[PDB]
Amino acid sequence: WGSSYVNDFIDRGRVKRVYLQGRPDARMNPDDLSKWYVRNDKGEMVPFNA
Amino acid sequence: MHFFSFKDAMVFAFAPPSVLELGNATGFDLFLQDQAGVGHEVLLQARNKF
Numbered sequence: 001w002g003s004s005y006v007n008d009f010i011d012r013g014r015v016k017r018v019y020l021q022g023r024p025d026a027r028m029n030p031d032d033l034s035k036w037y038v039r040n041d042k043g044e045m046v047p048f049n050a
Numbered sequence: 051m052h053f054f055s056f057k058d059a060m061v062f063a064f065a066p067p068s069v070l071e072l073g074n075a076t077g078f079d080l081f082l083q084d085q086a087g088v089g090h091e092v093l094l095q096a097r098n099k100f
Binding site: 012 | 087
């Protein structure tokens with residue numbers, strides 16, 4: 001949701017930023033966030049609504 | 051004459067200007083730039099061309 005800044009990269013001569021944000025359609029609505037799954041300690045994939 | 055006549059290495063010896071505050075070296079000074087983002091290679095050639 002909050003586009004994270006990770007590092008720079010040169011672009012046509014110039015240092016510019018590299019942002020990492022989730023797809024537009026995955027942060028539009030309140031239930032749209034339940035889509036985002038996290039890691040489980042035991043290797044598995046825990047959901048967000050959990 | 052002693053050394054600038056060596057292919058071994060350039061040995062350009064010189065004296066500082068009248069007012070030392072500006073220079074270390076007399077005559078003129080300027081910078082060739084790169085407004086297009088042509089890249090290093092062109093500008094390097096441009097330096098020699100010039």
